[PDB]
Structure formats: structure tokens, C-alpha cells
Amino acid sequence: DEITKKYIKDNIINVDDNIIKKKDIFKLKNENNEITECAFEYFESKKKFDDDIESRFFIINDNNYNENINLIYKDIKYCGLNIQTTGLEVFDENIRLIQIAVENYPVIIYDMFNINKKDILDGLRKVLENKNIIKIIQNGKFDAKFLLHNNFKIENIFDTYIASKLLDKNKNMYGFKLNNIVEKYLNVILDKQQQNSVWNNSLLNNNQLFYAARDSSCLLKLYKKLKEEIKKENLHIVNDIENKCILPICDMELNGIKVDLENLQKSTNEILNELNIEKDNLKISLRNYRRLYKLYSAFYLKLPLHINTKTNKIHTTFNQLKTFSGRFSSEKPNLQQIPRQKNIREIFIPNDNNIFIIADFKQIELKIAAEITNDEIMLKAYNNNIDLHTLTASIITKKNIPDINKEDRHIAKAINFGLIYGMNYVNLKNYANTYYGLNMSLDQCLYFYNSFFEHYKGIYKFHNQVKQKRALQYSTLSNRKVIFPYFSFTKALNYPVQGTCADILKLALVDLYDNLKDINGKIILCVHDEIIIEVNKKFQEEALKILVQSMENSASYFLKKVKCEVSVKIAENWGS
């Protein structure tokens, strides 16, 4: 009517007589401080908002497209970026809106359901691609994923969700949605009710648009506050790595990993025949039937649920900041819960004309411990390329390296992993006999304990410092920080080691993502201390080097007294 359909030409529904269209003249500045003016039609709320968040907006469609709007983008350095989608899955859903909030201007809202001329998005694509303009985003992985899948290029991101998560230091598992973050840092309550509104129509009501404008311009004010808190916490280095790691993570999720259905259904029939063999031949046997039962039901039966029927690809979900240590986690499916047996990981293959390159660190955790504790014997041994287990064997047995046998090294393995991570000699005994099948005595493990820390004086001093301080706040070599709810000696030792691994892998993915562009390399997976890339077979030897140096250079960034070792192989399946 005169009210509801008043702005139907702009594809807007006036739901409550609370929207006016206005036309004013806006000043436009460039790099040379020159001011040129333009007249723009924008929308505003009749009832003013009880805050200072920019709530006006331009809407861009085919009927009103004013090219001069792109002049707002001239010589800017940051902008709030948000999108509205019709759902959560980038493959099944569409981008309904794109919002860009430039400081001191009403938000520019691209009505994507009512745009069909490519010229309208030109100035948009430039802002996104411009590596010298910061795009402030909330949930950058989610938004970047949609933009990438819709053939939008983007670079330079500051994720307010990553900053808030890092500042929380794993003290809370909830409170990181836009609504929470804005209420905390700005004391403004956004109309979160609009998330459940209908975005699939070619028309939107005024309330949906005021929300799409305010949920994008608020990013400008969150960036200033969060940027300052990051700096005060000395979290810039980690926050920067995490922000740059968004794109490699999107790359992994968008590429997925191809599944060989032949071996899948085959192995399903095989383990199934072994299970039926158990039932028939029975009704050793228990452990066998149970193993095959979990293998079949918990894996062979669940996995097909995630296979893209049209591409035989799995598109897992990588969580950037949901583990205690900062390591990646995955879900739907959880890649680290997939069995390690070569019988099962052989099912994952590269695309045609491509091949996998798989790389691992050998002993990154133990080398990190040596650097953190600054233990002279360990650092010198690593630098002379002496094996750490052989080393400890020579200390325990007092033998020289030529007289050290395999049983000596096996015992030393248990001592190293047990004592480096904070066990006492009693726990060492149980740990050794349980996981290594050694049957050592308390008097022996007591000798191991005293001998270990008598020679590894750096570790002994570091461990004693941790016990005495009983501190709750710990940091990694990237200065990623955590605060414990209560003091645990073994967790205090483990966090800087595991958290530094996270830093190294995440920085390796960032360098790798840049180094692979020349050969259109694809980042596939990151689990534990390994990364998998997929490349055309002709760039095989070139990608082998890129992956190794991306991981070596990352470790070199954090470790100054010890050199990492990368084991790398070229494979046609994940089971190799």
C-alpha cells in the first residue's frame, strides 16, 4: 500500500512505518585531500537508535545503481564486511546480501537477489581483493567461504571472532557470537531476532535491513577496541597468524578430499563378512568381533554419510580455535578419529591427474621442550644430529653410542616421553610396563628419574619452577595465552609444547597457501603434525620442496636453538 509497498522499487517492505528514503549530498575525499561532492539516495529509521552505530544504508540494485557510490571506496584503509546467507551450507545456499561499512558513511548494501549487471560489483571486487584494505569480519571463515565459492576474491582480514576468542584465553566455551561480542564491547544489543527471518525472498523488510546495516558497521567500532586489546595483551603475532590462516582453512574445506568408493564398499563387505564369520562360527574371538564391530559400525557405516554423492568428496569442518592447545580439530567427519590402518586410509585419494604430498615433523614436541627448558645436553645433541632416545640411553646405561642396543633405546623412549611430560618414577613404572611392555621396578624407575634430571639440568630447573609458581597463565612461543581454572603440573608442561605446535602448523599453512599459488596447489588436510597438499603430477618435485620449506621456515620463526626435521613422501593415497 501507500506504506508497506512504498519502496517496492528498491525491493523493500515497510513493515512498521519506520523507514524513510532520503537524498543528501555527501563529501568524498581522496588521497590528495581533494573533496568532491555527490548526491546519494539512502534509507534511514524514523525512530532513532539509542546508540551511535551507523544505521543508515544505501541499497544497490539494477534500477537505482549509481556508479558514484564506488567513490566512497577511494583511499580507504579498513571496512566492515558482512554477508547475509539463506542458510549455513555454502554449497546448498546463496549469498542474499553483502554489506560494506566505510567509516562515517551509511552502510553500502548489495542486494544480490536484485543485481544482474556485472558492472555493479566491480568496485566491490576491488575492495575485497585489495591486500591494502583491511576487511573487518565476524566469523571470517564462514563469510570468506561463501565469497570464495561465489567467485569473489578476498585478502587481508581481521576476524573479530578470532580476536575475541584469543582474548578469552579458553576461559569460556560460549559467548563468541556477534550479539554477545557487541553487547560486551559496545553495550549495544543487536536485533538477533532477524537471524531467523526469511532471507530467501527477493524482498526484505526494513527491520532486516537495519540489522544488516548495523551488524556490519558495528565491526568498525569492534576493530578499534579489539585491535587495542590485542596489542595490550601482546597477542598481535598470534592474532595475525590466525587471521591469515582463515584462507588456507577455507581452501581445505572447499577442496574436500576425494573418496575411492570401490575400496570403501569392498572393505565394508570384507569387515562385514568377518563379523558374520564371528557370529556364525562362534555362537581372541571377543577382541576380534569387537574390533571389527567398531570398525564397521563406527566408521565404515558413518563415513558414507559425509560423501558428496556427485563428487565422491568429503568436505570436513576445521575448527580454528576450539581446542585447549590451539591445534586444529575437525568434525563431520572428525579426521583424527578415522582409523590409521593403511587398509582404511588408502580409501582417500587425490583427484585425477593429481597426487598427494604428505609431510610430517619427526619430534617437534620434544624439540620444543628442549628449547623452552633451554637444556644444554639436549640442544647440543639435536644440533649434532644425535637421536634423543639414543642420547638418554647413553645417559642411563653409561654406554657409548656404538654399544647401545635396541632394548636400551626402547627403555629410553619410555623414560623421555614419561619424564619430559612430568611423571614421577611411580607413574613411569606403570607407564613403561603398560605401553611399552617392559616390567621395570620402582628402584629402577627411581634410578631413571634421578639420572634423567641429574643430566638434563635445564628440564629439572624448568619443571621445578613450574611446580613452585603453581601459575594459571601460560603462553606459547607465539604468545598465545591460556588461563587454567586450577593448577595442573602436567597440563602446565604440555600447553606451551602443544600450543607451539599449533602456532607452527598454522604459520606453515599460511606460508604454504602463498607458495602454492604459482602451481595452483591445493591444501587438503592438517592432522597432528602432518599436512597434505594436492598438486598436478607435473609440479610433483616442485611441490615437494614448497611443502618442506613452508614447514621448515615456520619452525625457524619460532625455534632459534633447535632445527626441525620434516619427513615427506609423495603418495597416491593417505595410507602410504
Ligand SMILES: [Cl-]
Ligand atoms: Cl605478555
Ligand SMILES: [Cl-]
Ligand atoms: Cl592484530
Ligand SMILES: [Cl-]
Ligand atoms: Cl621435528
Ligand code: NA
Ligand atoms: Na559475519
